[PDB]
Design a protein around this ligand. Structure first.
Ligand SMILES: O=C(Nc1ccccc1)N[C@H]1C[C@H](C(=O)O)Nc2cc(Cl)cc(Cl)c21
Ligand SMILES: N[C@@H](CCC(=O)O)C(=O)O
Lengths: 274, 279
């Protein structure tokens, strides 16, 4: 049985408690199909982290079930114990989150919206992307062309834009010299969570929210808000495996086959488009 | 040795071929040397390598990889076919050049798909692509699965739609939708420019083709009349990748270098420099 690590990240992985008999509540998609759910063990919340069975489903779980059937492997799913995707932190840096669990052997496969980047690829093997990634901008149903719009490039208090404090976006902007002016503007307005930032766009307190395009398109599926402009800072989400994994070739070939036959587009229409 | 044979193929704006300055015989500005084999006549296979110059999105990527990965190269334009097709069990095109060890890598608008990945290794995708559908503004098509495409003779008159054959897009249609594929062949287009003219003049209702190229053409279309359905919607999302020989020693550093370019914002910048559209 392959040990799969995942993380709570809607709409790719939903995490919900089991029902009172320990099963997962039977539910259905917008297209009218039953939601496939797997039990995923993980923490519940300087407090003890009691690990309990929970119900996991979404884009990434649908993909896992496909891969498992297609490549004839068995699996057990758990939620990353420290709640993190995976950054190198110094104690001699060490990987936390899903990256550290994969490298330590606590997981054999990362199945999650794990952004492909150079730092992680130095240490692990990514598949070909199962979903292409980028940033976009969430606004009230307001035109912004994207990262090169004058109201972003030349910021003023008349048009407030922000992201999530300490997020990957926050870090990414701090890193590029050319984004210095936008970074300092966001720094004055960044929110503690995505949910709060999205609520502030609804309430005309934040005019534009810079965040992952898949999440933001998922959000615009409620609609008073919309995504706007061209995507920017694009990359992809891939399945993560150790360098030695005998699965990596067929995992990546299966992902190509699922893009090419429309399986992946179906996933987008079930979980991201509405 | 770090001097590599690399094959490419003209397809603007990814690879743009220009004539060399004949006095100086040196490529300047943002271009690099690239040669093309041209036959003397139709009686024999004798030919000459013409010295030409190449530029574009993929050429800037090649130049950056040459610097960071530390190699030099002899860039040539493929003349045995185009991107890559298996004909009578023999790959031609850029894929064939790599499969048969005439090129260490293939750099261009080369789509990553499953069948090509069985015979070559691909780098990480360095730009997103897939299949899009271009129409004249107002033509209604829901997507590839529109029954105007799937069951074309359910409609009178039938929808007129085609692709440029022998690439990844036709391969996908042929595999997924056999009735649609056999129907489209009568609308096969010799190239993208032919197809765009056929669309603008009403001789074709839809043109199905590589998403990166179609969305670049829509952005440049005089009058902004040619559009990709959805709003640049991409079916069968994939990417352009560098093709390398199976088990190539260069793949790891190429991969890491391309991801470094992403991480430093340079791919975003290249995308804005070459692929921006007026429309
Ligand atoms: O930065 C974050 N989370 C975060 C939130 C609050 C504080 C710190 C971090 N998530 C990003 C990056 C994450 C990754 O691959 O590291 N993938 C990933 C995938 C999707 Cl689908 C959406 C996002 Cl936003 C993200
Ligand atoms: N980029 C395509 C060619 C154009 C197409 O068929 O869409 C390929 O690599 O085959």
């Amino acid at each position: 049985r392959l040990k799969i690590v995942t993380i709570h990240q809607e709409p790719f992985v939903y995490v919900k408690p089991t029902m009172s008999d320990g099963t997962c509540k039977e539910e259905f998609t917008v297209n009218g199909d039953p939601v496939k759910k797997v039990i995923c063990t993980g923490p519940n919340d300087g407090s003890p982290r009691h690990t309990v069975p929970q119900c996991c489903y979404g884009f990434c779980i649908d993909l896992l079930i496909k891969l498992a059937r297609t490549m004839n492997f068995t699996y057990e799913v758990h939620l990353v114990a420290d709640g993190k995707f995976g950054t190198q932190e110094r104690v001699k840096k060490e990987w936390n989150g899903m990256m550290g669990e994969l490298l330590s052997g606590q997981a054999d496969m990362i199945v999650a919206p794990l952004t492909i980047n150079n730092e992680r690829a130095q240490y692990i093997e990514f598949s070909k992307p199962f979903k292409y990634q980028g940033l976009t901008i969430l606004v009230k149903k307001t035109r912004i062309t994207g990262i090169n719009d004058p109201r972003l490039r030349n910021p003023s208090d008349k048009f407030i834009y922000a992201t999530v404090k300490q997020s990957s976006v926050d870090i990414y902007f701090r890193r590029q010299v050319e984004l210095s002016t936008m970074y300092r503007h966001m720094e004055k307005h960044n929110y503690e969570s995505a949910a709060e930032a999205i609520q502030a766009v609804r309430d005309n307190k934040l005019h534009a929210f810079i965040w992952d395009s898949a999440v933001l398109e998922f959000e615009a599926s409620q609609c008073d808000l919309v995504t706007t402009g061209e995507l920017f800072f694009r990359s992809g989400f891939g399945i993560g495996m150790r360098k030695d994994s005998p699965w990596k070739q067929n995992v990546s070939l299966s992902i190509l086959k699922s893009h090419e036959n429309g399986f992946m587009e179906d996933l987008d229409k079930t979980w991201v488009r509405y | 040795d770090n001097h590599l044979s690399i094959v490419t193929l003209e397809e603007a704006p990814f690879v743009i071929v220009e004539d060399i300055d004949p006095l100086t015989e040196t490529c300047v500005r943002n271009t690099v040397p690239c040669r093309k084999f041209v036959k003397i006549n139709n009686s024999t296979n004798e030919g000459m390598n013409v010295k030409k110059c190449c530029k574009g999105f993929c050429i800037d990527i090649l130049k950056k990889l040459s610097r960071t990965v530390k190699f030099t190269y002899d860039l040539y334009l493929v003349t045995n076919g185009k991107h890559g097709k298996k004909v009578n069990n023999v790959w031609n095109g850029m894929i064939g050049e790599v499969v048969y060890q005439r090129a260490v890598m293939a750099v261009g608008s080369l789509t990553i798909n499953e069948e090509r990945s069985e015979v070559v290794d691909f780098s990480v995708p360095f730009v997103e692509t897939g299949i899009s559908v271009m129409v004249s503004r107002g033509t209604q098509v829901t997507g590839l699965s529109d029954k105007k495409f799937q069951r074309p003779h359910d409609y009178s008159p039938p929808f007129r739609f085609g692709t440029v054959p022998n690439g990844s897009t036709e391969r996908n249609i042929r595999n997924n939708y056999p009735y649609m594929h056999q129907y489209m062949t009568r609308f096969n287009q010799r190239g993208v420019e032919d197809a765009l003219v056929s669309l603008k003049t009403g001789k074709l209702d839809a043109f199905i083709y590589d998403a990166a190229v179609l969305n670049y053409k829509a952005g440049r279309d005089e009058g902004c009349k040619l559009v990709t359905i959805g709003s640049g919607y991409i079916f069968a999302t994939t990417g352009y990748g560098i093709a390398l020989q199976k088990g190539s020693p260069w793949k790891r550093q190429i991969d890491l270098a391309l991801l470094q370019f992403v991480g430093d914002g340079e791919m975003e910048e290249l995308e804005t420099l070459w692929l921006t559209g007026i429309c």
